[PDB]
Amino acid sequence: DKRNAEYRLAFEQLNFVGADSKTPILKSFIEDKGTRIDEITFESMIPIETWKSYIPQLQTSLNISIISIEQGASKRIVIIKSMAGDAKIPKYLPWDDKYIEEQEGVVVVGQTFSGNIKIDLNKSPHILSAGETGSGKSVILRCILWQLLKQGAIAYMVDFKGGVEFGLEYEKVGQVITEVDAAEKLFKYLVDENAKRLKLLRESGSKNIGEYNKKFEGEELKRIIVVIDELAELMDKTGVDDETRAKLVRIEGYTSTLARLSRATGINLCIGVQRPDAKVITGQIKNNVPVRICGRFADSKASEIVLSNTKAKDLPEVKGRFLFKLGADTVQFQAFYFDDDKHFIPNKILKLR
Ligand SMILES: Nc1ncnc2c1ncn2[C@@H]1O[C@H](COP(=O)(O)OP(=O)(O)OP(=O)(O)O)[C@@H](O)[C@H]1O
Ligand SMILES: OC[C@H]1O[C@@H](O)[C@H](O)[C@@H](O)[C@@H]1O
Numbered sequence: 001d002k003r004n005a006e007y008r009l010a011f012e013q014l015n016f017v018g019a020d021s022k023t024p025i026l027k028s029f030i031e032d033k034g035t036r037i038d039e040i041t042f043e044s045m046i047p048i049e050t051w052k053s054y055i056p057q058l059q060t061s062l063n064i065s066i067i068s069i070e071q072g073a074s075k076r077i078v079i080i081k082s083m084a085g086d087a088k089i090p091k092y093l094p095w096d097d098k099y100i101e102e103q104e105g106v107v108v109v110g111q112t113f114s115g116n117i118k119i120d121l122n123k124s125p126h127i128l129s130a131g132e133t134g135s136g137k138s139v140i141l142r143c144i145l146w147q148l149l150k151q152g153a154i155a156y157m158v159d160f161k162g163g164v165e166f167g168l169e170y171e172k173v174g175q176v177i178t179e180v181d182a183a184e185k186l187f188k189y190l191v192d193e194n195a196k197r198l199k200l201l202r203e204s205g206s207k208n209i210g211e212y213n214k215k216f217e218g219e220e221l222k223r224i225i226v227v228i229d230e231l232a233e234l235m236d237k238t239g240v241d242d243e244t245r246a247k248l249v250r251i252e253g254y255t256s257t258l259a260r261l262s263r264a265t266g267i268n269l270c271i272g273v274q275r276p277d278a279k280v281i282t283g284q285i286k287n288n289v290p291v292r293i294c295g296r297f298a299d300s301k302a303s304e305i306v307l308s309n310t311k312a313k314d315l316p317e318v319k320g321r322f323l324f325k326l327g328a329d330t331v332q333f334q335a336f337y338f339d340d341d342k343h344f345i346p347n348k349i350l351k352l353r
Contacts, residue, residue: 003026003029004026006062007024007026007062008023010058010061010062011023011024013061014054014057014061016046016054017045017046018044018045018046019045020045022044022045023044024042024043024044024046024078025042025043025044026040026041026042027041027042027043027077028040028041029041032311034329034330034331034332035311035314035323035330035331035332036083036084036087036113036332037067037081037082037083037311037314037316037332038064038081038082038083038084039079039080039081040079040080040081040082041072041077041078041079041080042077042078042080043072043074043076043077043078044076044078045076046078047075048069048070048071048078051069051078052069055069058080062082063084063085064080064082064083064084064085065082065083065085065316066080066081066082067081067082067083067314067315067316068080068081068314069081081314083316087113088113089111089112089113089321089332089333089334090111090334091318091321091334092319092320092334092337093110093111093320093334093335093336093337094336094337094339095143095146095336095337095338095339095343096336097150097343099116099147099336100147100150100151101118101147101151103120104151104152104210104223105120105121105122105151105223105266106118106119106120106121107119107121107144107147107148108147108336109140109143109144109293109324109333109335109336110140110320110322110333110334110335110336111333111334111336112324112331112332112333112334113331113332117324117331117333119144119291119326121223121266121268122208122210122263122264122266124290124291124326125262125263125267125268125269125290126259126268126269126270126271126288126289126290126291127141127144127268127269127270127271127289127291127293128231128271128273128281128285128289128291128292128293128306129141129270129271129272129273129293130272130273130274130276130281130292130293130294130295130297130306131274131293131294131295131296131297131322132274132295132296132297133274134319135295135296135319135322136295136319136320136322136335136337137272137273137274137293137295138165138229138272139320139335139337139338140293140322140335140338141227141229141270141272142338142340142344143335143336143338143343144225144227144270145157145225145227145270146338146343146344148223148225148268149173149174149225149349149352150348150349150352151223152222152223152352153222153223153224153225154174154222154223154224154225155173155174155175155224155225155226155227156174156175156177156186156190156224156225156226156227157170157174157175157176157177157226157227157229158177158183158186158226158227158228158229158233158234159176159177159178159229159230159233160177160178160179160180160183160229160230160233161229161230161233162178163176163177163178165229166229167340169340169344169346170344170346172346172347172350173346173349173350180240180244180247180248180251181247183234183247183251184247184250184251186226187250187251187254187255187258188250188254190224190226190254190258190267191254191257191258193224193265193267194257194258194261194262194265194267195261197209197221197264197265197266197267198261198264198265200212200221201264201265204216207264208264208265208266209221209223209264209265209266210266221266222266223266223267223268224266224267224268225268225270226267226268226269226270227269227270227271227272228269228270228271228272229272230272230273230274231271231272231273231280231281231285232273232274232275232277232280234248234251234252234255235248235252235279235280235282236277236279236280237249255269255285256282256284256285256288259284259285259288259289260284260288269289271285271289273306275302276297276302276303276305276306277305278305281305281306286308290326290327291324291325291326292306292307292323292324292325292326292330293322293323293324293335294306294307294311294312294322294323294324294325295312295315295322295323296312296313296315296317296321297312297313298313299313300313307323307325307330308325309325309330311323311330315332318334320334320335320336320337321333321334321335322334322335
């Protein structure tokens with residue numbers, strides 16, 4: 001084999017031999033086609049310290065970006081997590097209105113290996129974005145929102161933390177929800193509106209909202225984008241008042257109902273999650289939210305909750321570098337950087353009519 005033959009010369013060239021005077025032997029190269037993070041296993045007599053000392057040389061020799069070098073099952077075996085020099089993805093990519101999709105309902109979240117990541121909300125209607133504080137899971141949601149505002153959609157924004165993440169400029173573009181009573185009224189309305197559109201399609205004999213809009217002129221239904229900053233504000237019922245938790249259990253009722261029956265009604269949920277918990281990302285939320293955006297999660301348990309795999313732990317530590325799952329396949333992408341005080345121009349959306 002070519003790889004074993006290649007690696008052998010790279011080691012001979014570095015005189016990278018153990019106490020036994022023998023070069024590391026390649027046990028397995030497990031390449032990921034989706035994330036494109038390869039897993040290079042070697043068993044040598046060289047200690048993990050000497051390996052780490054050689055990461056800059058090993059990168060230049062094998063032409064790889066070493067994500068991590070860890071010790072395997074035995075103190076003889078090492079595992080390298082890397083990406084070839086050809087798995088080229090920007091380390092930083094800002095937002096540009098040039099990316100805004102023409103097709104009403106298609107949104108672009110960033111750049112991948114082969115092209116850009118696109119989500120058609122007529123096909124995949126709900127997005128679950130997850131990541132630690134400062135990962136940029138909010139940035140994505142704001143960018144999806146901007147693209148939909150530009151597409152002329154109705155926007156609702158949920159942030160129970162005084163609505164600080166949805167400032168006075170966001171307020172101009174749509175309704176901002178800050179309390180459980182407002183969220184109760186909003187989610188009840190969203191279920192009623194979803195059901196209202198559900199019968200219009202039945203009666204009109206139209207597949208989606210677009211197929212009805214081309215049948216009724218002055219009665220055109222606009223897309224509804226409802227972004228939730230922290231699912232846990234609606235999910236996590238622990239601590240609140242006896243009357244407040246009946247309100248939260250109603251919000252949870254309506255949310256489940258929204259995610260389940262709103263593929264054709266053009267009502268979309270974009271949910272951010274800081275702390276992936278099974279009490280928050282319920283199987284009802286999982287079964288009905290098809291789009292998964294995942295930041296680097298140190299734990300294997302938090303990644304399984306989100307992606308239904310342990311891929312988030314192998315993410316190269318790059319600000320805005322996420323994982324993307326839709327259906328079975330899981331891919332690596334660099335999320336566009338959406339700067340609020342650079343790209344969010346609320347008057348450009350008010351001009352739209
Ligand atoms: N795509 C990106 N490229 C480069 N840097 C990024 C990117 N996304 C985020 N960052 C940086 O990290 C910061 C984190 O911002 P952000 O508020 O979106 O993250 P968050 O804490 O996970 O979400 P939230 O506000 O909902 O708590 C950004 O302000 C920016 O400095
Ligand atoms: O929050 C619910 C309210 O949202 C508004 O955008 C609508 O115009 C109202 O009809 C609705 O009752």
